[PDB]
Design a protein around this motif. Structure first.
Motif, PDB file in Angstrom:
ATOM      1  N   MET A 212       0.809  -1.214   0.000  1.00  0.00           N
ATOM      2  CA  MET A 212       0.000   0.000   0.000  1.00  0.00           C
ATOM      3  C   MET A 212       0.850   1.275   0.000  1.00  0.00           C
ATOM      4  O   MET A 212       0.346   2.334   0.362  1.00  0.00           O
ATOM      5  CB  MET A 212      -0.932   0.048   1.220  1.00  0.00           C
ATOM      6  CG  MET A 212      -1.902  -1.121   1.346  1.00  0.00           C
ATOM      7  SD  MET A 212      -3.273  -0.968   0.186  1.00  0.00           S
ATOM      8  CE  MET A 212      -4.420  -0.017   1.180  1.00  0.00           C
ATOM      9  N   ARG A 213       2.108   1.213  -0.450  1.00  0.00           N
ATOM     10  CA  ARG A 213       3.055   2.304  -0.258  1.00  0.00           C
ATOM     11  C   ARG A 213       2.829   3.470  -1.222  1.00  0.00           C
ATOM     12  O   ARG A 213       3.042   4.623  -0.854  1.00  0.00           O
ATOM     13  CB  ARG A 213       4.484   1.791  -0.442  1.00  0.00           C
ATOM     14  CG  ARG A 213       5.522   2.694   0.205  1.00  0.00           C
ATOM     15  CD  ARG A 213       6.999   2.419   0.090  1.00  0.00           C
ATOM     16  NE  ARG A 213       7.428   3.017   1.339  1.00  0.00           N
ATOM     17  CZ  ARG A 213       8.560   3.667   1.549  1.00  0.00           C
ATOM     18  NH1 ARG A 213       9.438   3.823   0.578  1.00  0.00           N
ATOM     19  NH2 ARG A 213       8.815   4.167   2.744  1.00  0.00           N
ATOM     20  N   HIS A 214       2.393   3.175  -2.451  1.00  0.00           N
ATOM     21  CA  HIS A 214       2.563   4.081  -3.573  1.00  0.00           C
ATOM     22  C   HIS A 214       1.430   5.088  -3.689  1.00  0.00           C
ATOM     23  O   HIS A 214       0.340   4.874  -3.165  1.00  0.00           O
ATOM     24  CB  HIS A 214       2.636   3.267  -4.855  1.00  0.00           C
ATOM     25  CG  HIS A 214       3.617   2.152  -4.771  1.00  0.00           C
ATOM     26  ND1 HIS A 214       4.964   2.365  -4.626  1.00  0.00           N
ATOM     27  CD2 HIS A 214       3.448   0.820  -4.782  1.00  0.00           C
ATOM     28  CE1 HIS A 214       5.586   1.210  -4.556  1.00  0.00           C
ATOM     29  NE2 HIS A 214       4.680   0.249  -4.663  1.00  0.00           N
TER      30      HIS A 214
ATOM     31  N   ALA B 185      -4.504  -3.507  -5.701  1.00  0.00           N
ATOM     32  CA  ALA B 185      -5.403  -4.651  -5.567  1.00  0.00           C
ATOM     33  C   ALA B 185      -4.667  -5.987  -5.457  1.00  0.00           C
ATOM     34  O   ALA B 185      -3.525  -6.120  -5.890  1.00  0.00           O
ATOM     35  CB  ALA B 185      -6.313  -4.679  -6.766  1.00  0.00           C
ATOM     36  N   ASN B 186      -5.380  -7.014  -4.984  1.00  0.00           N
ATOM     37  CA  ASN B 186      -4.796  -8.334  -4.794  1.00  0.00           C
ATOM     38  C   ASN B 186      -4.454  -9.027  -6.118  1.00  0.00           C
ATOM     39  O   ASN B 186      -3.610  -9.919  -6.132  1.00  0.00           O
ATOM     40  CB  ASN B 186      -5.598  -9.196  -3.810  1.00  0.00           C
ATOM     41  CG  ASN B 186      -7.006  -9.487  -4.279  1.00  0.00           C
ATOM     42  OD1 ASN B 186      -7.846  -8.597  -4.336  1.00  0.00           O
ATOM     43  ND2 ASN B 186      -7.266 -10.734  -4.624  1.00  0.00           N
ATOM     44  N   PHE B 187      -5.094  -8.621  -7.225  1.00  0.00           N
ATOM     45  CA  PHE B 187      -4.838  -9.188  -8.544  1.00  0.00           C
ATOM     46  C   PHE B 187      -3.731  -8.433  -9.291  1.00  0.00           C
ATOM     47  O   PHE B 187      -3.559  -8.639 -10.492  1.00  0.00           O
ATOM     48  CB  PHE B 187      -6.134  -9.311  -9.359  1.00  0.00           C
ATOM     49  CG  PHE B 187      -6.939  -8.051  -9.561  1.00  0.00           C
ATOM     50  CD1 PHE B 187      -6.613  -7.129 -10.547  1.00  0.00           C
ATOM     51  CD2 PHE B 187      -8.057  -7.801  -8.784  1.00  0.00           C
ATOM     52  CE1 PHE B 187      -7.360  -5.972 -10.726  1.00  0.00           C
ATOM     53  CE2 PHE B 187      -8.813  -6.654  -8.968  1.00  0.00           C
ATOM     54  CZ  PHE B 187      -8.464  -5.741  -9.939  1.00  0.00           C
ATOM     55  N   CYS B 188      -2.935  -7.614  -8.590  1.00  0.00           N
ATOM     56  CA  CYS B 188      -1.899  -6.801  -9.213  1.00  0.00           C
ATOM     57  C   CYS B 188      -0.512  -7.198  -8.726  1.00  0.00           C
ATOM     58  O   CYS B 188      -0.336  -7.520  -7.551  1.00  0.00           O
ATOM     59  CB  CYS B 188      -2.086  -5.359  -8.795  1.00  0.00           C
ATOM     60  SG  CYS B 188      -3.580  -4.661  -9.527  1.00  0.00           S
TER      61      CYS B 188
ATOM     62  N   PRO C  58      -4.663  -9.770   4.800  1.00  0.00           N
ATOM     63  CA  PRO C  58      -3.306  -9.940   5.308  1.00  0.00           C
ATOM     64  C   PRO C  58      -3.231 -10.672   6.639  1.00  0.00           C
ATOM     65  O   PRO C  58      -4.041 -10.433   7.533  1.00  0.00           O
ATOM     66  CB  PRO C  58      -2.873  -8.485   5.468  1.00  0.00           C
ATOM     67  CG  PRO C  58      -3.522  -7.824   4.291  1.00  0.00           C
ATOM     68  CD  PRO C  58      -4.920  -8.380   4.384  1.00  0.00           C
ATOM     69  N   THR C  59      -2.258 -11.582   6.749  1.00  0.00           N
ATOM     70  CA  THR C  59      -2.094 -12.335   7.976  1.00  0.00           C
ATOM     71  C   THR C  59      -1.649 -11.402   9.099  1.00  0.00           C
ATOM     72  O   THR C  59      -0.884 -10.464   8.891  1.00  0.00           O
ATOM     73  CB  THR C  59      -1.187 -13.553   7.794  1.00  0.00           C
ATOM     74  OG1 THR C  59       0.093 -13.127   7.331  1.00  0.00           O
ATOM     75  CG2 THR C  59      -1.774 -14.568   6.839  1.00  0.00           C
TER      76      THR C  59
END
Lengths: 97, 203, 55, 199
Positions: C1-3, C34-37, C45-46
């Motif tokens: 989630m940095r960008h 997204a998770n598909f990226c 997330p664990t």
RNA sequence: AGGCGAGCGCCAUGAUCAUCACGACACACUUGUUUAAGGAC
RNA sequence: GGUAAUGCACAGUGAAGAGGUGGCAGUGUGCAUCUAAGACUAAAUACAACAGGAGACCGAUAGCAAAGAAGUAGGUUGACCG
RNA sequence: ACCACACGUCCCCGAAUACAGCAUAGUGCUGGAGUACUCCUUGGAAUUAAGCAUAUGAGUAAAGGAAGGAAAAGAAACUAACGAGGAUUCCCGUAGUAGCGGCGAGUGAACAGGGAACAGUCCAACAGUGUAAUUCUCAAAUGAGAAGUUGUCAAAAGGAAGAA
């Protein structure tokens, strides 16, 4: 629910203890007496040097006309407490006499 | 003794002698610059309750503060939000006016520690206070046995963290059910203790 | 989630996934969070709050 | 550089002197304007007392008695302690507000001097009323420096004496009678008159 | 403490505290008329 | 949470030396418990950079953005972006 | 040769200073960096109520000030009505309770009872008057001077253990 099962009469019971009397502290030593005297003395000098404040003058004036209930209401509004008012009236009365 | 007589006179603030002196002194305080050094304490008894002695390495400074409530810092009254948060005037500060005096003296006298403060006067525009200061880098003070504690590094800037007699009173500290909002150390310490989820090993 | 990422919205002939704001690099316009990226965030997330022991 | 005249200093507004260079002048404007204000307004009876003080002639008479009871210097004190105890208890004049008030309260004090130019005044304000209540005679002196000179040391607020050597007794009694005239005898009348603005 | 109408209200004037204009002084406050001008506005 | 005011402020007003409190407004009166408006204090509690030890964790489109000269090559007029 | 421990040397810009504010008999001190955690101020909106204005999110985010290895707090103008207890902080618990709330949505503490760790003290009020006995400087082997009467001055070395 384990609440509100006894009546008020039975809740008021108590176990029969043996009490100890309180140790009274009435004796006041020589040095304590002089200490209190000097404080009361100092309070005289201030009143002598600087006199009464404006509301104290207005209050004492009403006492001469026997306007007792007016003075009571006036003092209540100045000091807030009905107890402080009752005390200050008694001190002012004694000063005038 | 002498200090008792001074106490009784200082308490009679509507005696003829005290009305005279308050009037002349409040005139002088306003002709001077907003923070200035004093020659000594105005009230000897009061300064001595709060820990002043006439030794090298202690001083009195005097400060003035403007009176009344402090308005919200917005242009044209426009707050960009809900109507219950649109009020500008009749908003009162959290800290006493005394606290502002202490904070400003501490900035000016940066080489010294703020000990305690007291009231000395009022008029239509200003309120006036004396602040007691100490110098920790002074040989006389470093070897005292009553105020040598002010030299501990934790004692830097007490006034900025709400630790002085004037700055402490807005915190809401006390003992009993009337002060439940500060159980723990402060309001924020109580908040943390009440808004946390505890997750034990066996559960 | 940095960008720093934002969607381009419709009308550009592209799928409305968030994309990376940049210039001067091949990374410009790629598909972010997204998770598909590639390089995005995993699904659920664990997390340390899981119950490790048993009675 | 140049000394400003009284007229100039009374004209200037202190709040418009702002530079670091100007601070000494700001001090002088304040000092002169304060004087004009205090002369313009009425003094309460208790503060008005400290406007009345001994003549330089009476001050001489009093000092010429009292000077014979001067306190010990550190040089003298050292010598005394190498020697043994001898003779009768000395008479000495005493100093400082804390001790003086104690001696008045204990009814030990026999005569007292007080200085007028003291700031803040609340330090000495109560002394005459206490002296009148204990029945001790007193007198007022213009400056703190006048007192310092009697005992050959730094200025003070008040001095006190608790004993009389027979040698001095005749002169002492006369001095007390002069003082009672100007001060203690007049007290009850004084506490009712307000200080007029000055001409 | 005076006076009127079949002790009442009404009409006279004499003591007790605030108090609204008007004067005349200078001390707060105001102004580069400043060794000065205003003025409790 | 504090409910006919839980705490904090500002303006008017402003004490007594004896006062404060006993989760519902007021007035009176016994009873119980404390002593404000000055100060100091260890231990038991919280958590980055940096160092050390472990793991039913990930295995080069994963795991930190970065397993090589990675906040680098390169980019914005700029803040910043990568 | 090479390595490891310490020391010496350490260009220009930068708080950047031949400066600003401030204290003492004098020497001086502050400024900038860092700020996860602690203390003091200031203070939102998206969102939930299936709309929305009180309310919620929240005294949270953001912005400012300040300190330490922790910080804050702390020895009752405290609880309780029992046959009573006894500083502060932390854990289990009272409790999603007493209550607050377009009594809607939602919010929400305290004493007890069981433990960890435990410690109490200072200033003012109130200092020898047959002598400021008190702090500092230079000299000297016993003198000069500064602060202070608007009040100075209220006592011990010392040790083996423990840990990395």
């Amino acid at each position: 629910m384990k609440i509100n099962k006894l009546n008020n009469a039975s809740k008021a019971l108590s176990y029969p203890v043996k009490k100890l009397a309180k140790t009274e502290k009435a004796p006041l030593t020589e040095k304590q007496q002089r200490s209190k005297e000097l404080k009361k003395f100092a309070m005289s000098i201030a009143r002598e040097v600087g006199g009464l404040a404006p509301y104290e003058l207005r209050a004492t004036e009403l006492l001469r006309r026997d306007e007792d209930k007016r003075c009571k209401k006036f003092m209540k509004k100045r000091l807030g407490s009905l107890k402080m008012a009752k005390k200050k009236i008694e001190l002012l009365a004694e000063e005038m006499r | 003794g002498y200090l008792q007589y001074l106490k009784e006179i200082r308490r009679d603030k509507q005696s003829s002698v005290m009305r005279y002196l308050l009037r002349v002194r409040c005139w002088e305080y306003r002709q001077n610059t907003a923070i200035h050094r004093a020659s000594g304490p105005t009230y000897l008894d009061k300064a001595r309750m709060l820990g002043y002695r006439n030794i090298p390495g202690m001083c009195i400074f005097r400060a003035r503060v403007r009176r009344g409530a402090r308005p919200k810092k917005v242009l044209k009254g426009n707050t960009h939000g809900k109507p219950s948060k649109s009020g500008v005037y009749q908003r009162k500060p959290a800290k006493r006016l005394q606290a502002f005096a202490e904070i400003r003296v501490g900035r000016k006298c940066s080489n010294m520690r703020v000990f305690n403060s007291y009231w000395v006067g009022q008029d239509r525009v200003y309120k006036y206070f004396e602040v007691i200061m100490v110098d920790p880098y002074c040989d006389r003070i470093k070897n005292d046995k009553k105020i040598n504690w002010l030299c501990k590094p934790v004692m830097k800037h007490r006034e900025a963290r709400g630790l002085t007699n004037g700055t402490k009173t807005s915190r809401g500290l006390g003992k009993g059910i009337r002060y439940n909002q500060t159980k723990g150390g402060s309001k924020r310490a109580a908040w943390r203790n009440r808004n946390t989820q505890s997750l034990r090993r066996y559960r | 989630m940095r960008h720093s990422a934002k969607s381009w919205g419709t009308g550009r002939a592209m799928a409305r996934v968030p994309r990376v704001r940049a210039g001067g690099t091949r990374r410009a316009g790629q598909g972010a969070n997204a998770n598909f990226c590639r390089g995005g965030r995993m699904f659920a997330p664990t997390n340390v709050n899981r119950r490790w022991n048993r009675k | 550089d140049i000394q400003l005249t009284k007229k100039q200093l009374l004209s200037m507004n202190p709040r418009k002197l702002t530079n670091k260079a100007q601070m000494d002048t700001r001090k002088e404007v304040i000092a002169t304007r304060k004087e004009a204000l205090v002369n313009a307004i009425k003094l309460p009876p208790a503060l008005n007392q400290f406007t009345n003080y001994l003549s330089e002639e009476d001050l001489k008479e009093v000092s010429d008695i009292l000077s014979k009871f001067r306190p010990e210097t550190r040089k003298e004190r050292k010598q005394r302690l190498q020697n043994e105890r001898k003779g009768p208890k000395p008479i000495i004049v005493k100093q400082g507000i804390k001790h003086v008030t104690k001696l008045i309260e204990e009814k030990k004090a026999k005569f007292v001097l007080i200085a007028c130019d003291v700031d803040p005044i609340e330090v000495v304000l109560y002394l005459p009323t206490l002296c009148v209540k204990m029945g001790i005679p007193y007198a007022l002196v213009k400056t703190k420096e006048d007192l310092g000179k009697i005992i050959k040391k730094k200025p003070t607020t008040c001095l006190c004496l608790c004993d009389v050597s027979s040698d001095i007794k005749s002169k002492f009694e006369n001095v007390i009678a002069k003082c009672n005239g100007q001060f203690k005898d007049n007290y009850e009348s004084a506490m009712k008159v307000w200080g007029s603005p000055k001409e």
